Amino acid sequence: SSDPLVVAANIIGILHLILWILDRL
Amino acid sequence: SSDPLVVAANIIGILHLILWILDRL
Amino acid sequence: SSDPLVVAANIIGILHLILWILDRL
Amino acid sequence: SSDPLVVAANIIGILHLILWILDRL
Ligand SMILES: [Ca+2]
Ligand SMILES: [Ca+2]
Ligand SMILES: [Ca+2]
């Protein structure tokens, strides 16, 4: 299986990066 | 039995995301 | 082996940190 | 033992959060 906390970590990090890039652009 | 390291990572990432959103708003 | 999801977490985090530093400077 | 890839994830996120706060403050 996969750790649900690591998936959550990825989701949070990906969203933060995406929202920040779109904010700047 | 969750990994505290991974829990810490989620707390940091989520706090950072929330603090950044609220600052931009 | 290493968890691919933890590898993705590092890649995302360090990319975000690098892009933000570069943006600011 | 602790997973070093998870330690690094915490170090990156913590550094990034701190740098961003200090930059805003
Ligand atoms: Ca503000
Ligand atoms: Ca710039
Ligand atoms: Ca500044």
**Nearest Cα residue in chain A from C18:** A17
CA distance A8 to C25: 30
What's the Rg (C-alpha) of chain C?
Answer: 11
Q: Does B1 carry a binding-site annotation?
A: yes
CA distance D16 to C3: 23
* Structural domain containing residue B13: 1-25
Distance of alpha carbon C24 from the chain centroid: 17
Domain tally, chain C: 1
A22 CB-near residues (< 8 Å, 6+ apart): none
Angle at C18 between CA C16 and CA C22, to 5 degrees: 120
Residue B5 near residue D8 (C-beta atoms within 8 A): no
Residues from chain D that touch B16, judged by Cβ atoms under 8 A, are 13, 16-17, 20
Mutation target vs D (from C2, C3, C6, C22; most D CBs, 10 A cutoff):
C6
